[PDB]
């Protein structure tokens, strides 16, 4: 996938500058519907232009539209982490899918 490679490359570029400057997102199981999960968890980051291309690139892999402000849960077992940690985690999962084919 060229699309997959482009996304990996964009994540590498943006996390090589602390990604979204003190914004926190909830973790998720990324092993199950990874792309939509990552978009769902990243769609509500509100003042970070560095993540916009990432958000658009992720939308290309999700087979439904991902809108901001939607209810998921109260995230009881989940945990707030930095966008950068989330994105670096996401990158690992994406590299494996690349490697798997």
């Amino acid at each position, epitope marked *: 996938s060229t699309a997959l*490679r482009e996304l990996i490359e964009e994540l590498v570029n943006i996390t090589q500058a602390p990604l979204c400057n003190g914004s926190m997102v909830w973790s998720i199981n990324l092993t199950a519907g990874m792309y939509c999960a990552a978009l769902e968890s990243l769609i509500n980051v509100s003042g970070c232009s560095a993540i916009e291309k990432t958000q658009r690139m992720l939308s290309g892999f999700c087979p439904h539209k991902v809108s901001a402000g939607q209810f998921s849960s109260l995230h009881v077992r989940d945990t707030k982490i930095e966008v950068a940690q989330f994105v670096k985690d996401l990158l690992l999962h994406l590299k*494996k899918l*690349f*490697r798997e*084919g």
Partner: antibody, heavy 121, light 108 residues
Framework: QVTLKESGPGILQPSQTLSLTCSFS??????????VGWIRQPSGKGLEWLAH???????RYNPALKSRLTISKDTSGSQVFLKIASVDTSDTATYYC?????????????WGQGTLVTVSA | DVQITQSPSYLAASPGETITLNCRAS??????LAWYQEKPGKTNKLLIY???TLQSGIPSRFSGSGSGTDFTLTISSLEPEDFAMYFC?????????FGGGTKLEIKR
């Protein structure tokens, strides 16, 4: 520093199963980002990618040979193995193992010297 | 499945010359081409990857260029140790495929 070295049968009869070993120093296939592939060159012809394996056991195989190939590593991640089932004379080649220069992408930063395998009666 | 052509497959040049080698893919490979140097009794040496990225510890007189389907390796001011067989490999797409090489030999 990083070295790789192939070991093989030298010669085998057709319909046999070629077993190749790659031994290496200066890295382990239990470290993140590490992986090893097998590439071959029939004489006066070009290189042909066969298979590769990563530290987390993700494997890929050349679809033209997919069924005949099995790649593995040991639990100490210090050797890598290729099996080619049902060899014929088209499998006569020099066989190289090589380390991947990236944690996801497939180009090779270090190569072994190669070993000749002749498949003949 | 991408076929890689290196043409011409033979070149002669005198030291100090600047030369270019061609590598052509049968379909676009974005920028993902690697170049390797091959020498008798030596292990193959990676020079460039992703079209233009110089491997660590390789002299900067090696320069890779191109994108899509047409690629070049330029070696400027050839040193004696620079004469060798040079082959390319696309790493855009599985299965990975190699060009048939160009032998660069010294004119004397």
């Amino acid at each position: 520093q990083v070295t790789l070295k192939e070991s093989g049968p030298g010669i085998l009869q057709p319909s046999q199963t070629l077993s190749l070993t790659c031994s290496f120093s200066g890295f382990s296939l239990s470290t993140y980002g590490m992986g090893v592939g097998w590439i071959r060159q029939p004489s006066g012809k070009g290189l042909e990618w066969l298979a590769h394996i990563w530290w987390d056991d993700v494997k890929r195989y050349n679809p033209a040979l997919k069924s005949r190939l099995t790649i593995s590593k040991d639990t100490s991640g210090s050797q890598v193995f290729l099996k080619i089932a049902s060899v014929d004379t088209s499998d006569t080649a020099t066989y190289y193992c090589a380390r991947m220069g990236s944690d996801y992408d497939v180009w090779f930063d270090y190569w072994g010297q190669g070993t000749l395998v002749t498949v003949s009666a | 499945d991408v076929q890689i052509t290196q043409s011409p497959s033979y070149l002669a040049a005198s030291p100090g010359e600047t030369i270019t080698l061609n590598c052509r893919a049968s379909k676009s490979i974005s920028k993902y081409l690697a170049w390797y140097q091959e020498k008798p009794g030596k292990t193959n040496k990676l020079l460039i990857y992703s079209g233009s990225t110089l491997q660590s510890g390789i002299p900067s007189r090696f320069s890779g260029s191109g994108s899509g389907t047409d690629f070049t390796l330029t070696i400027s001011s050839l040193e004696p140790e620079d004469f060798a067989m040079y082959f390319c490999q696309q790493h855009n797409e599985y299965p990975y495929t190699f060009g048939g090489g160009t032998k660069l030999e010294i004119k004397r």
